[PDB]
Amino acid sequence: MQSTSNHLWLLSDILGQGATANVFRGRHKKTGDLFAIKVFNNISFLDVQMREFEVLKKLNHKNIVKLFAIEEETTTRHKVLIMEFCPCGSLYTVLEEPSNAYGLPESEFLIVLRDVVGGMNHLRENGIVHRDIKPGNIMRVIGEDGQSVYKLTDFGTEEYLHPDMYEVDLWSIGVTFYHAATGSLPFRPFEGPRRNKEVMYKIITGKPSGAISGVQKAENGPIDWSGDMPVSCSLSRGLQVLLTPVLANILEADQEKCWGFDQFFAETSDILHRMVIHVFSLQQMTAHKIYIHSYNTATIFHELVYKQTKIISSNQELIYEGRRLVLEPGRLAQHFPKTTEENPIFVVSREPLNTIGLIYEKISLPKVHPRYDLDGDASMAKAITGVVCYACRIASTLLLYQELMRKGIRWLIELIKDDYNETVHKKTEVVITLDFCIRNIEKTVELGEISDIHTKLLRLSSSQGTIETSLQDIDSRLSPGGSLADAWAHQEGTHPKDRNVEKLQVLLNCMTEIYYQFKKDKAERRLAYNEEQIHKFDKQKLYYHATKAMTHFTDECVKKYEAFLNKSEEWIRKMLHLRKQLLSLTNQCFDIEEEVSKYQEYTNELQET
Ligand SMILES: CC(C)c1ccc2oc3nc(N)c(-c4nnn[nH]4)cc3c(=O)c2c1
Asked: Which residues does the record list as N6-methyllysine (modified residue)?
């Protein structure tokens, strides 16, 4: 409960403690405006210090916390610093939440990388060495437009250190972005870099120079490597493709072949300056995100789709808002239509495509031990709540996929019907032409060319008539009740009416409440006898919520998703066969449309002076 000239803070409002100064929740005394006070009790060693802090006062930027003033505590004469209060916490705080247990959401990851790189660029423009970049050293405030604003705070932890040290600037940034991407750290021995400290350094130094992750699965065991994000990471493959190279080449200890800052700020800005176009491969039931600059063309856009789904350019037939897209190779990306996850561009290819659907990592979940270990129960509750939160994220993605298939199929049928009606238009164009050449030849009536041409027109109507029978049978399929009807799609799956996502999130909210309370029990050390009781019963309720939610996820979701997906393969096959027939019959209405007139403009018109 110390005080100062201005400002004042309570001692129970301690938010962070560490080397030298702690950080409290202070006020302004004259006003009730909140502040963050750095106490600085250990004023060891040594004018120059107040000057190297006076420069920190003037420096103003969106991605840094601001030092407002320095003051002297009343009773102890300790150098206290007032700073911008960040009510949301730090980047490590949001990485503690089970929603980010397997990685930040895609949009908020862009907010992190934007604000982090922008803040470090502004610091290097003034020459402020940070080096020790950490999620704890990255705070979060809410912007005036909601959103989020991340700000650096401490400049001028062993887990985020370069190999040359660990007892060189871009190493910490790579480990933080990987931690933010997948919700887990890279380079991990067996259960933290604790006693396996010598194991950790063996992982950090001597790296395949192209990988990003290292992890052993057993005690004193082997280390697996990978140059890609894991399957569990909830980040679009359209973003991992251009995010892997920057990580794999800044985490290389060889300073000869490591990105400088100018190249780091160049590749990162390239990522941030792009826009996203949502594309759902209907034939494969896979959603995608194309990260493409606003000045690029549609040709490179089709190439980026080929890089994800292996669909050949110019064979990619695009659907949007129930209509075909018919894009041009010169149109800029900033002129494309809007794209959301719930309104993505659908993609067919007229070729047989392997339907794979969504690929997610099975977890199988952890066990709860009857041991009363509080810190063990806290760390266990954090992992298991992130697991069921992963199942909710997968369940919402599988529901989106099913509903998007229903929309893309419902449009695709109404698109085939339009092409079917266009073929009928060209059919009657040949019919009326065939009628006006038959009744004209039969009106005028050696004479061998008369019967020859007449029987040739009889051959035209004979093939044209069987084309009509084949078309009306095709419509009999497109008609309700027959094949290719989008009737099964309204069944066999899950719908927002079933509210499976909400049935899982109510148990997820009960879990995260128990987990938040278990983390409070960690700070309280020993608990009261009654609080020990409720900690035990809620510990068992965590297992009951897990068994009930996970069973509802595997028996309602997934299982019905597999049935809807297995039947989607059948309808896709029958749809490709339908479009192959209707296209061939449409071509048959074009060559015989040229066979007439040829047998009308000529051969019926003779000459005479
Ligand atoms: C949820 C808890 C853990 C919380 C909430 C708000 C916070 O708000 C902060 N605002 C600051 N300006 C600084 C700071 N660190 N170094 N300099 N200022 C630290 C914090 C917190 O730790 C914090 C924690």
From this structure: 559
